[PDB]
Amino acid sequence: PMPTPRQKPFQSGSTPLHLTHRFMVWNSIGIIRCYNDEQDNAIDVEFHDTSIHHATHLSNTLNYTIADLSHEAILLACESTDELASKLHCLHFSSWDSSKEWIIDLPQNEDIEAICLGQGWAAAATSALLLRLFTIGGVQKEVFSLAGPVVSMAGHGEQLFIVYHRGTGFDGDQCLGVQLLELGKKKKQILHGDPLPLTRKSYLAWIGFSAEGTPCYVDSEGIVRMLNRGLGNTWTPICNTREHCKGKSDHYWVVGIHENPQQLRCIPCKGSRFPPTLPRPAVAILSFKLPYCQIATEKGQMEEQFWRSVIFHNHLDYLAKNGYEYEESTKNQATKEQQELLMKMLALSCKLEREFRCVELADLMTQNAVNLAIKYASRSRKLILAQKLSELAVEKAAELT
Amino acid sequence: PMPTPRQKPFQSGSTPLHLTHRFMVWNSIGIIRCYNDEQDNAIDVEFHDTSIHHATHLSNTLNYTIADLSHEAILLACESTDELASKLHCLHFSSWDSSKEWIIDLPQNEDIEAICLGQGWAAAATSALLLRLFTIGGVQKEVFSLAGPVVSMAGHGEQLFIVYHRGTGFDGDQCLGVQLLELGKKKKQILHGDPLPLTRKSYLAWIGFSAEGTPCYVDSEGIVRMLNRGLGNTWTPICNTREHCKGKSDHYWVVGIHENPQQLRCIPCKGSRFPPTLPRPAVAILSFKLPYCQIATEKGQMEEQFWRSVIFHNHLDYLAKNGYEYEESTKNQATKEQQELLMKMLALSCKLEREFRCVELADLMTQNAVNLAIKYASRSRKLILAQKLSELAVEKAAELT
Amino acid sequence: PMPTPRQKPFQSGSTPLHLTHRFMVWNSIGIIRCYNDEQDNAIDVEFHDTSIHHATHLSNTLNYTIADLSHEAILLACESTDELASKLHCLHFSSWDSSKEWIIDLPQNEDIEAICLGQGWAAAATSALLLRLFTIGGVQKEVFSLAGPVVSMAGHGEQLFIVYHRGTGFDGDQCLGVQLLELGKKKKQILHGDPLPLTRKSYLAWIGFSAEGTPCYVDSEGIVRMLNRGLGNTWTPICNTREHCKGKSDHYWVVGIHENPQQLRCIPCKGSRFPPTLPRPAVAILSFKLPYCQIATEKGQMEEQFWRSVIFHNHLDYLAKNGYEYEESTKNQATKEQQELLMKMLALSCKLEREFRCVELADLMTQNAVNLAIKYASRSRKLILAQKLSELAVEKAAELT
């Protein structure tokens, strides 16, 4: 076995630096393209919703190579030269005051290797293995040391999502860890350098949050995983873009993940793994599908639908806990689609005379759904099944009290 | 230094696959032997308690190579071929319904590498670095990605005990991590890929739970460790089978661990590390002994007895917290044997005029035991010791209030 | 890339063993020097405060090579020979009883590789990857297995601070993890083998606790980091001794860290990284400075002062939570210096017409400080700023209720 070259830091939604016309970032808010050249060096920011901000043009002169874009600011970063220091620059436009942009130099011999924007704050991972926090208005906040060289960073609300190198992988594998922090009034380290699961012989392609606030990331083998707060903060695979690829040379380039409605916003690519900058590629929508067994049979189909519903509605409870604004109609509807799938699966299981499986499915139901399944059973009629469902209902009522 | 070959997945209680007549699994519930051959391919399940189920014979045809056995089901698993997929098969016999067995195919190019049974559920770790959960009745449940290739899995109640590869060890050492999950109504990740302690230049030989529900595992150097819930979920060594070995070629092959009464059920082996399938080996009982210093002196003897009692009665509090059924007489008796050992150790320490050590031991006592030690001291008589014990008793009463 | 030689265990505050007259330990309590020689082998203990204990001289005969010193005991440890076992020896002098010292042998072929003293207890990390706990009076307590070979251990109160090897680093880097435990009535594992951040191509030079009880450690590249309990138990850099070094050959040798008053007690070194034993080196005091950007400007200066105050007063809340004795005047004064820095930074930000930044700073203020900033704004007068501060004050009052 022999040591795997350790992946270099990158910005999710960016195309390589050697390009003449590259994407600095493409996310759910807009696009930031750079145009480096011997003649001019331009940067331009477009917004998907042209009402959030006007198209912004900047005369690139500091050779900013990293950028992130939020609904409230533009973050740019450049490494150091023999003349100048590595600089972090911010155009927080949503500000109500006259002074609009700030810029700060890192100490000598420290180079910005990754950046990201959250809600009201920005973060920079540097060559000194330091994480430096800022308000969008330019106030330096806490600083702490990283457990290893950064690979990529994402931000959402008060959450900071860091991926780095735990150590050295072997035979094509990376060895990445994740540090997950919450930067509110009550600071928390949700994930203390947990090992980051990847497909073997693959590297990290994309990281970020869904619009609703759930951490997600994408393999180089097309496998899309999402944090599963309802399962002990494990990582559940929710897509595999390779099944939407026709040849080995085909890839999908992720730009966005949305939970409600569910949609994987990516850009189809044919030659390489990233789209050429022009003509402007069309954003394709890929459906999420969890890698369940026997997906063609009705049972497996419905099981996949059920668990997809569950994991894609954990975020509602996350918004509720942290006092964010959520719409309880969506919780209700999530419940009812899940109970409908459970009822259909119990009917299906019942027509196959697998009544123990029916009781198992009823364990996942609400009391009302169970009360209804008791009658359904009492009509096939699996009378013993009806009794077992009745005892289960008694047990549920004993748990509520 | 040079990279250690990374141990292959295995099933605790199994003998190698190349054998003609092998043990697929030997645990506290029964034995599953396989007999692969060019003539016939048989599988047979025996039960230690012949009242739990009748001896079961299956006409092996799918070349199942992995198996686990619980008090309610038989789990079998086979990898994929060029013709067929990797299959998970279950004979849940304790079911009250007619339909008894189910079987499901994994997706194409995914191979089952480990399996285990819990209470009402089964789990499969696969070649895609996926953990797939099932009800014993065949309902697919949650799926999540593993941080590394699996080594072995065990299940008990709602607990899932996963051991895998954090990374690459060097100079004979493995680099294994443990993920410990609880799969009840409230999902929990107890251990987030904690590093799994091992003896140097040793690999993982056996993992599982004690009958009472505590995670345990065994080195290849004979060292038996158990989770210590009373010590921050660290891992405490509770045995060393090598001290019951007379020559380097002698080994003990673990099949069971019991906490009350304490017994390490293993099978003595002379030629190799595993028993030949026939004649049927006799299960030997080894005593647990924690690796304490100066075990021959009365002080060290009693210290070992004390801490053994403590760690082997943490499981009672675990059953109590999770609403399982425990017998409070056992808690009471555990308390009284511990207080007796403490009292004997305080008397011993007192006859050596080490009175500070006496007070230290009294810090571990109940109020009644301390109140009695005050008099004992008042009779040697270390009068100052009596006062220090009195002030300690006052402090204890201040802590209770 | 190629495997880094894995650093050997060491005792913080010690000079190499090959020296004729070496420091066994130098901490905030005193100094323990050893003098190994073919003629005599002496050990002597001095106390900074000559009232804690008298100078102690011991006729070294067991060739003790490890030592630690606390305000209540002297801990010594020697490896095993072909004749004798590895021994742990303790002179607990603060005891009120006649019997003063104890000594215990480790099992055969187990060698003490690290030791440390806490409050009322001592710990030994051994060649069997075991951690063995003792009372200072000689009672063996819990034992548990280490996830890797120890590098160094420190103790303070009920806290146990372990640093070890997670795995193998590459290209000059170590791969160290930290296990942080609390050994009170309620045992806790605060840190489950978290990755220990280090400067690249550097090893671990010093570990310990501040006098007030906060874990700290020092790079071989002079960077001093401290646990940040107010930031999710991350690690914040609080010093860089290299900036107090004039040439590459200059180093500082840490002996103590104090939080209130803030002072980094170290010894300046010119030839090597450690001081010669005589003449007795003078303890220098280095100021802590967090690595903030643009430290020369008034804004950066004040930001550094603010965050230094915050992190150096987390320990007060730690003492409060665990029922230790703290002085609430220090909490009050910490608050007022922080509010003064915030007020000065808001005035500075206001004179630059960056009013959004002013509101951001006010988010960190107390209600009274905000109420005062409302008037200040109302006088520049940024009237809109005054209103935004007023709405912020309303929001704060809504949070308190």
From Swiss-Prot, chains A, B, C:
Complexes and interactors: Trimer. Interacts with the polymerase alpha catalytic subunit POLA1. Interacts with MCM10. Interacts with DNA2. Interacts with CDC45 and GINS2 subunit of GINS complex; these interactions associate WDHD1 with the CMG helicase complex.
Superkingdom classification of source: Eukaryota
Biological process annotations from GO: DNA repair; DNA-templated DNA replication; mitotic cell cycle
Phosphoprotein listed as a keyword: yes
Organism listed in the record: Homo sapiens (Human)
Example GO molecular function: DNA binding
Modified residues (Phosphothreonine): T401
GO cellular component assignments: cytoplasm; nuclear replication fork; nucleoplasm
Residues carrying N6-acetyllysine: K248
Name this polypeptide is given: WD repeat and HMG-box DNA-binding protein 1
Main location: nucleus
Location of this chain's protein in the cell: Nucleus, Nucleoplasm
UniProt function note: Core replisome component that acts as a replication initiation factor. Binds directly to the CMG complex and functions as a hub to recruit additional proteins to the replication fork.
Keywords annotated in UniProt: Acetylation, DNA-binding, Isopeptide bond, Nucleus, Phosphoprotein, Repeat, Ubl conjugation, WD repeat
